[PDB]
C-alpha cells in the first residue's frame, strides 16, 4: 500500500520575466505570433485551458493548484 | 571578495565593483542594463551632491537658531526670506528654472553626447566643458584645484568618500523630513531632547512612529 506522504520537486520552473514578453508561449499553435486578429482572441480563450497545452497530468495539476 | 551589503550573498553580475560605492546592492535589478546604469550613476551623484548641500545648510542654520542668532527653522525659511526681503515668489521661481534649465540641459546633452559641450559654442569655452567621466565633469571650472588632475590613487579615494558621504546625506535629509512630521520641531531641538533623556525621548515614545505603543 502506497504511503500517504508529502512529495514535491525542487525548483521545477525558473522565475523569470522572459515569457511575459513572449505572448502565447504556453501553446505550440500560438507561440509563433499573430498573422491575423483571430490570434489575439485565441490567446485569451486558451490561456487557462491547461490540459490543451500539455498531456502531462502532473504539469496540469501544478498549474491548477497555483491558480 | 569585496565587502557587500549582505555578507554571504554573491554580488550581482552587472555590479562588477568598478563604480564608487559598489557594494553589490541592487536587489530589484534596476540597473541591470548598462545604459540604464550609467544614467542611474549620474542620478545618484546629483541626488547625493544636492543632499550634501541641503544637509549642511539645514545643520548650519539650525545651529544658528539653537544658539539664538535669529535664524529660522529650515521648514520656515522660505516664508521668512520672501516676506522679510520683499521678494516675489514666482519671479524667484522662474529665475531658478532659467539658470538650472541652462546648466541641467548642458549636462543632459553631455550625457547623450559626451564632449559635445566642448566645441566652443558657449562663449568660446572649450576645455572646461569637455567632461572627464560619467558624472565627474572635472576641468578648471568644476575642479579649479585640480584634485582630479593629480594623484590617480588619491582621486579614486575621493570618489569613494564623495558617494558615501552623499548617501549618508540623502538618508539624513529623509530623517529631517520624517522627524519634522513626527515631532514638529527642528533637527537640533530633536537632538537636544534626545540627549537630555535618551531612554525616554526617541522615536519609540514620540506617539507617531509606533502607533500600537
Amino acid at each position: 500500500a502506497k504511503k500517504v506522504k508529502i512529495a514535491v520537486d525542487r525548483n521545477p520552473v525558473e522565475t523569470s520575466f522572459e515569457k511575459w514578453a513572449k505572448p502565447g508561449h504556453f501553446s505550440r499553435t500560438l507561440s509563433k505570433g499573430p498573422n491575423t486578429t483571430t490570434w489575439i482572441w485565441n490567446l485569451h480563450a486558451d490561456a487557462h485551458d491547461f490540459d490543451s497545452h500539455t498531456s502531462d497530468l502532473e504539469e496540469i495539476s501544478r498549474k491548477v493548484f497555483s491558480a | 571578495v569585496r565587502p557587500v551589503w549582505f555578507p554571504g550573498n554573491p554580488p550581482p553580475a552587472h555590479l562588477d565593483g568598478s563604480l564608487a560605492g559598489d557594494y553589490g546592492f541592487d536587489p530589484l535589478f534596476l540597473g541591470q542594463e548598462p545604459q540604464t546604469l550609467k544614467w542611474y550613476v549620474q542620478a545618484e551623484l546629483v541626488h547625493g551632491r544636492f543632499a550634501m548641500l541641503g544637509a549642511a545648510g539645514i545643520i548650519l542654520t539650525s545651529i544658528g537658531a539653537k544658539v539664538g542668532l535669529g535664524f529660522p527653522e529650515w521648514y520656515d525659511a522660505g516664508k521668512v526670506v520672501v516676506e522679510k526681503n520683499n521678494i516675489d515668489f514666482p519671479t524667484l521661481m522662474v529665475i531658478q528654472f532659467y539658470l538650472m534649465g541652462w546648466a541641467e540641459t548642458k549636462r543632459w546633452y553631455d550625457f547623450k553626447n559626451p564632449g559635445s559641450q566642448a566645441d566652443g559654442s558657449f562663449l568660446g569655452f572649450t576645455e572646461e566643458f569637455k567632461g572627464l567621466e560619467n558624472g565627474y565633469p572635472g576641468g578648471r571650472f568644476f575642479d579649479p584645484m585640480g584634485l582630479s588632475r593629480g594623484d590617480a590613487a588619491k582621486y579614486q579615494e575621493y570618489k569613494q568618500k564623495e558617494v558615501k558621504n552623499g548617501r549618508l546625506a540623502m538618508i539624513a535629509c529623509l530623517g529631517f523630513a520624517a522627524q519634522y512630521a513626527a515631532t514638529g520641531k527642528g533637527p537640533l531641538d530633536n537632538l537636544a531632547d534626545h540627549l537630555a533623556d535618551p531612554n525616554h525621548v526617541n522615536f519609540a515614545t514620540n506617539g507617531v512612529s509606533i502607533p500600537i505603543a
Partner: protein, 40 residues
C-alpha cells in the same frame, strides 16, 4: 529588466497606461474648469 520592460510594452499594458493618462488629463481639466459647454 529588458524582458520586464518588454512586457510593459505589450498592447494591453500600453492601453492601460495611455488611457489612464488620457482619462486623468480629462478628469483634471474638468476639475479646474468645471461645467464647460462652449469655448470663450
Amino acid at each position: 529588466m529588458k524582458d520586464f520592460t518588454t512586457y510593459l510594452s505589450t498592447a494591453p499594458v500600453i492601453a492601460t497606461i495611455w488611457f489612464t493618462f488620457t482619462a486623468g488629463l480629462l478628469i483634471e481639466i474638468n476639475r479646474y474648469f468645471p461645467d464647460p459647454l462652449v469655448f470663450s
